[PDB]
Design a protein around this ligand. Structure first.
Ligand SMILES: Nc1ccc(S(=O)(=O)N(Cc2ccccc2)[C@H]2CNC[C@@H]2N(Cc2ccccc2)S(=O)(=O)c2ccc(N)cc2)cc1
Ligand SMILES: [Cl-]
Lengths: 99, 99
């Protein structure tokens, strides 16, 4: 698909058996989602932007489906105001910026 | 161009006759640049980042070149972690996401 930026590029994802909406975000180094349970080990991390930093839990090697694409990656889980798909997983689906 | 996401999509921009590095950010609705001088009057704007909402200065109809492409639009100025080119100007340069 070619996705326009007239509007936020929102997509549906499946993770931990759950369907969530998330923003395809080239400015995000990492994928970050609102509070949820994920299997496996995790470690704490801090991520920041305008407004400051939040604490998240870093889960590695998590399977996600994004637009029919199956991908594997790191997911940060915490009190974020917006679910985003970051570069770590956009690369895995072959996503590029084009102009 | 076609820009992959293994590394941050940083490009060169020109504004006020100066070259700066900025991040192409499909998660940012709006372009926000580091503190700088711009002509004209500005208006208040609130923008929401991961740590919360902050006040920034809004300048409209500003000339800005992004990776060689000419744009004229709204440029926000404030304590952003990095210069980000948001959807308002990525649309102007004809940028899309593709996979
Ligand atoms: N590692 C890492 C660091 C930060 C984040 S993020 O701040 O949540 N995040 C997602 C987001 C926030 C708010 C609204 C919509 C999307 C970043 C990335 N896309 C926009 C946002 N930001 C730009 C950024 C932040 C840190 C490093 C490099 C760039 S931001 O400063 O919150 C921001 C928000 C809105 C606008 N107009 C401009 C900027 C995610 C992963
Ligand atoms: Cl590639």
């Amino acid at each position: 698909p070619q996705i326009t930026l007239w509007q936020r590029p929102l997509v549906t994802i499946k993770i931990g058996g759950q369907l969530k909406e998330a923003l395809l975000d080239t400015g995000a180094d990492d994928t970050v989602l609102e509070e949820m349970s994920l299997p496996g080990r995790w470690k704490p991390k801090m991520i920041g932007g305008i407004g400051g930093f939040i604490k998240v839990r870093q889960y590695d090697q998590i399977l996600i489906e994004i637009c029919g694409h199956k991908a594997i990656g790191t997911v940060l889980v915490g009190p974020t105001p917006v679910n985003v798909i970051g570069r770590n997983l956009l690369t895995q689906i072959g996503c590029t910026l084009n102009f």
